[PDB]
Design a protein around this ligand. Structure first.
Ligand SMILES: [Zn+2]
Ligand SMILES: [Zn+2]
Lengths: 89, 89
């Protein structure tokens, strides 16, 4: 159920290089399949293009490890090292 | 109601420099107040820090013109000029 699944999504995303934590995550079942949207933190100095490449890696990683996800939208926001101005999981 | 409001949110955001269209927008009433989350397109060559500054400008612009919004979360994804690989409003 959703709490365990969300934990596994977060652990998988945080293993991808360039990820500075997960800031936002929403997920729901549609039938037996999971639809999720997440926002990861990344280095503010990355270009937006580089951040997209990180989000694509997260998408492959998370989808690759969690069978039951049918759709996973990943995008990014700026996160400086150690900053406490944004939420995290 | 939500369709007119969403139109006005989109028009306001698209007047802010650095915005390459609105890609995603979700909004709901909580009581008489509006809570919204949006994703704007920006130049892939922007840094993530520059994209955040654009999102902050959108937030001031939209909130400044639409009284009834209590919370508006804005973040960004890469959008190349004329590209058709992402949705838009
Ligand atoms: Zn998107
Ligand atoms: Zn955020």
């Amino acid at each position: 159920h959703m709490e365990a699944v969300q934990n596994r999504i977060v652990e998988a995303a945080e293993r991808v290089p360039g990820v500075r934590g997960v800031i936002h995550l929403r997920a729901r079942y549609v039938g037996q399949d999971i639809w999720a949207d997440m926002i990861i933190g990344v280095d503010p100095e990355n270009t937006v293009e580089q951040a997209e490449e990180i989000c694509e890696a997260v998408q492959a990683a998370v989808c690759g490890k969690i069978r039951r996800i049918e759709s996973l939208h990943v995008s990014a926001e700026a996160r400086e090292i150690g900053d406490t101005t944004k939420p995290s999981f």
